[PDB]
Amino acid sequence: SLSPLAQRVVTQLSVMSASRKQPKLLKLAREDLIKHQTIEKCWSIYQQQQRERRNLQLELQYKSIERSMNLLQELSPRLFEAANASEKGKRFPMEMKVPTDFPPNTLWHYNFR
Template sequence: MFSHQQIRKPLLATFQQIRSKRTTAISPEVQKLVTQLSVLSAGRKQPRLLKLCNEDYVKHQIITKAWSQLRNQKKKSDEALLNKQLDSMSFACEELKKISPELYNLANKKEYGKRFPLEIRVPTEYPPRNIWYYDYVPPVAKDSKK
């Protein structure tokens, strides 16, 4: 009969051989060249084609077409809304120009060096990642006279 130690030693040796690092007969220069070429050609590789039966392929095409139509419809509605807003802004600017040219020129005056204030958050579709900026200190006015 074999003892427990006699059985365990060959198993450990086999396990260690399996987990050992593979060595190749390629020189490091050739290996570097192969790696560089594989990285360069990685961008040109095509994705694998889906292997679908005819019914599944038709379903896939229908879903893809419906999704692209939905995206196009959303894009057109967003573009129409933006065009409507632009028309409204240009109409308001023309009315202001007719009513008071001084106010129109003052509203459209270029101010260099003026930055967007931190207190105002740009409206987005998603909530901010940081809900509150705790370390905010408002800028001190330089021309305050005592």
């Protein structure tokens, strides 16, 4: 009927498939449904607020940069030129790592190079 390789392929396929592995549908009572809706809506609102806060902050930073660069242009042309360069190949430093869940054994390195 089937080889051992064929069997193992079928098993692998099954791992991915939804055939006889999935539970019943999540039914709720009307009160429960409402509670869920209120949880979700509030959360969504909170997320929107956070986005606006961050977005606003970014806008403020941009405005400050603009204000700075105009001033620099007014005062010292050479300094302005130096500031406003193409940073095409700018690379973030490899020490600035993505913050983990829990910290390492040695928290901070005081010596380098």
